């Protein structure tokens with residue numbers, strides 16, 4: 001059923017993805033790398049005291065605070081949803097091998113019984129209405145770029161001046177590049193404007209993953225994570241194999257002489273992709289305006305900030321269903337990419353821009369190093385982009401692609417199982433747009449709050465309510481997928497964007513509250529994804545610029561968890577046992593040092609002004625900018641803090657670009 005073509009790095013098609021400079025050449029050849037991360041300055045993730053601390057703390061918390069999740073997956077009582085063993089990983093050392101990314105997900109979708117297009121004309125109108133409401137009356141804004149971020153293929157530059165020039169030039173030449181692609185001249189568009197080529201695959205650590213303790217044996221068991229070998233990936237699963245990666249860490253002793261305590265494992269690794277920046281720039285120039293529109297006009301459904309901000313909406317509901325989606329990015333459908341492009345053309349968007357967008361969602365992928373002695377292979381032919389990888393993580397609008405797919409998918413699930421009486425309001429495009437516009441503003445008896453693959457579905461009192469309960473019961477039974485589009489189930493311990501929905505004895509939205517997930521506090525403080533990069537002088541370019549600051553926002557973020565105090569005390573006690581020092585004093589010192597370091601980066605902060613003006617969000621973001629790529633957005637951050645982390649291209653240049661893209 002068509003194996004994707006594959007080319008070794010030595011092949012000219014792969015060589016052309018890397019410019020003639022040392023960084024790009026090194027990225028092309030980089031071999032498998034592993035090693036302990038520097039968890040905090042001077043502390044390695046495999047330090048024997050640190051592991052002893054994690055062993056004691058994870059056992060203690062699990063023993064004293066067993067999960068409180070009912071049969072319907074609602075969290076109550078102590079606010080705990082699983083054991084605390086997820087922290088038992090040797091951070092920096094990956095499971096082996098990581099997966100080869102699937103070149104085509106068509107068979108994966110068909111075999112999971114998911115549809116190859118909108119099932120009914122109503123659904124077709126709703127997906128298209130989503131495109132019309134999201135992309136219509138957009139306002140230009142400057143194109144912001146993360147400081148220190150890479151341009152990936154083909155230059156691999158991390159220099160801000162170079163990145164700004166690449167982006168400006170890309171906005172100037174996107175039209176000529178898109179028209180070349182409309183003529184089938186992808187090699188020309190790539191050679192002349194670097195628009196095309198491939199995504200560059202980097203494997204990221206998912207630092208904590210499930211682990212259970214077998215009461216029978218007293219031995220810990222890590223969750224098996226299935227990975228595809230090369231044959232499987234290039235044949236869409238027709239050949240080759242899907243098998244459990246090895247998380248066994250015993251090897252670290254033999255290989256590096258690192259002591260491995262019982263029940264500690266190698267980390268789960270996930271594929272992540274960096275896009276060719278010249279192609280992404282023109283897409284980001286439209287995506288940000290779209291985010292601004294949906295987070296303002298449709299803030300009810302899409303703009304989520306604090307626990308209370310979420311709580312206000314959910315408290316008004318009579319029923320709240322916390323859904324889960326299996327493997328969202330890999331199952332994301334290429335037919336939606338095509339439906340979206342078709343609808344943008346219908347709205348009058350420039351064809352050359354739609355073509356760039358379409359191409360960014362069919363691009364080849366260059367696999368670097370999934371394991372020792374493996375990799376350095378290009379999947380797909382850049383001369384004619386035709387992959388179906390699902391949704392690429394580094395595409396310039398991935399968050400929006402997942403949000404559009406899922407928001408309509410959940411609305412369809414509510415229509416299908418609970419509100420057939422609303423079907424008559426969706427007769428054609430005009431009526432579909434009116435209905436979706438009202439639904440997204442939270443004005444219908446069926447509602448939702450969502451972001452990509454996380455969501456909570458709601459029902460107020462009314463005719464749909466009774467159906468809502470049957471849908472919830474169908475999810476609980478878990479025998480039939482309620483959607484024809486993606487694999488949907490209910491979340492075990494319902495949460496939304498990091499906050500757990502804590503129910504009381506009534507088990508009703510009206511008396512439930514959103515609280516911080518104490519397990520996420522533990523993940524962030526003791527299993528960060530990256531080391532502190534103490535050798536990177538410019539802190540704003542680090543993955544974790546000011547780790548100490550999170551101590552100042554901790555109470556605000558996690559204080560409402562029922563066992564907040566208990567956890568902080570267990571930490572103090574266990575850290576004393578392991579290090580013979582106070583964890584609280586250690587964090588207070590780090591907070592002081594980082595607060596002083598911060599004033600050097602903030603123009604408005606006096607040589608030692610302090611943190612008085614900063615919000616909890618500001619602090620969480622400065623300690624972990626990653627939260628700005630999955631939890632919050634630019635407007636949620638104080639302006640002077642956003643500037644520490646991001647730089648932009650002039651709105652004058654983007655304003656002119658946008659005028660040439662958008663309809664009349």
Ligand SMILES: [Mn+2]
Nearest residue numbers: 454491495496
């Ligand atoms: Mn959730």
